[PDB]
Amino acid sequence: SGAIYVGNYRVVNRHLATHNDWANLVWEDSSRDLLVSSTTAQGCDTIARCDCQTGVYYCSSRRKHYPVSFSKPSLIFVEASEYYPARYQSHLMLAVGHSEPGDCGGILRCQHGVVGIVSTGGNGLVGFADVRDLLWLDE
Ligand SMILES: NC(=O)[C@H]1CCCN(C(=O)Cc2cc(F)ccc2Cl)C1
Ligand SMILES: [Zn+2]
């Protein structure tokens, strides 16, 4: 669980979106595992606009933050689940680091701000759905 709040936006993993997020939909993309919904109050997260490859993510299964090097956003094959058939998930960045199914929603961030959220993982790897290209979150 976990979301990014930037202005009147709520960014969540599309597979964990609620009835409320779908009834207030702005944008959603199954290929990225992302869903953005409208909120009434103001959100104060800063989104990073950069090409950083180092940062810190929160791992809720360990109740700890961890520093990682992560790859550049790309199309990576993701094993079938109860939410999706087997497919390439776009805009994904991988890191060596601990991850568990309930860790989805944990924020990844660099000195510039929010980079993305935990979306995939397994075998000592952790995958993050990137949000730095979503320029419209700012405006
Ligand atoms: N983005 C997706 O399609 C997700 C949907 C939920 C399932 N999923 C995972 O990777 C689950 C997972 C397994 C594991 F061994 C360690 C961490 C995680 Cl996040 C793919
Ligand atoms: Zn950065």
From Swiss-Prot:
Reactions it catalyzes: Selective cleavage of Tyr-|-Gly bond in the picornavirus polyprotein
Active-site residue list: 15 (for protease 2a activity), 33 (for protease 2a activity), 104 (for protease 2a activity)
Residues holding Zn(2+) 1: 50, 52, 110, 112
Biological role stated in the UniProt entry: Cysteine protease that cleaves viral polyprotein and specific host proteins. It is responsible for the autocatalytic cleavage between the P1 and P2 regions, which is the first cleavage occurring in the polyprotein. Also cleaves the host translation initiation factor EIF4G1, in order to shut down the capped cellular mRNA translation. Inhibits the host nucleus-cytoplasm protein and RNA trafficking by cleaving host members of the nuclear pores. Counteracts stress granule formation probably by antagonizing its assembly or promoting its dissassembly.
Oligomer and partners: Homodimer.
Identification of the protein by name: Protease 2A
